[PDB]
């Protein structure tokens, strides 16, 4: 409701089913290693 976004960005992904758990701050795995890396202090939301 207030003080919500300053430089908001939106990202579109397409992955498998047993893969969303691998997309999170500090996660490890093939997808995190080679496809997409999330910062450790990621202040946002993940929607799947």
């Amino acid at each position: 409701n207030d003080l919500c976004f300053t430089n908001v960005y939106a990202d579109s992904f397409v992955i498998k089913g047993n893969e969303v758990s691998q997309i999170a701050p500090g996660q490890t795995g093939n997808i995190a290693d080679y496809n997409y890396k999330l910062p450790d202090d990621f202040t946002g939301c993940v929607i799947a």
Partner: protein, 48 residues
């Protein structure tokens, strides 16, 4: 008192860093830091 675990995985920073994920490693390092800082504070007060 540098060899006390203080309720952590181990007493060596290198193993904690290269054994777990960044969040849990950060928690363990925080616990170790709190313990060691309390040790220093106690020593300084006794010296005073």
């Amino acid at each position: 008192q540098l060899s006390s675990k203080f309720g952590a995985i181990s007493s060596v920073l290198n193993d904690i860093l290269s054994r777990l994920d960044p969040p849990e490693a950060e928690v363990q390092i925080d616990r170790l830091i709190t313990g060691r800082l309390q040790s220093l504070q106690t020593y300084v007060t006794q010296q005073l």
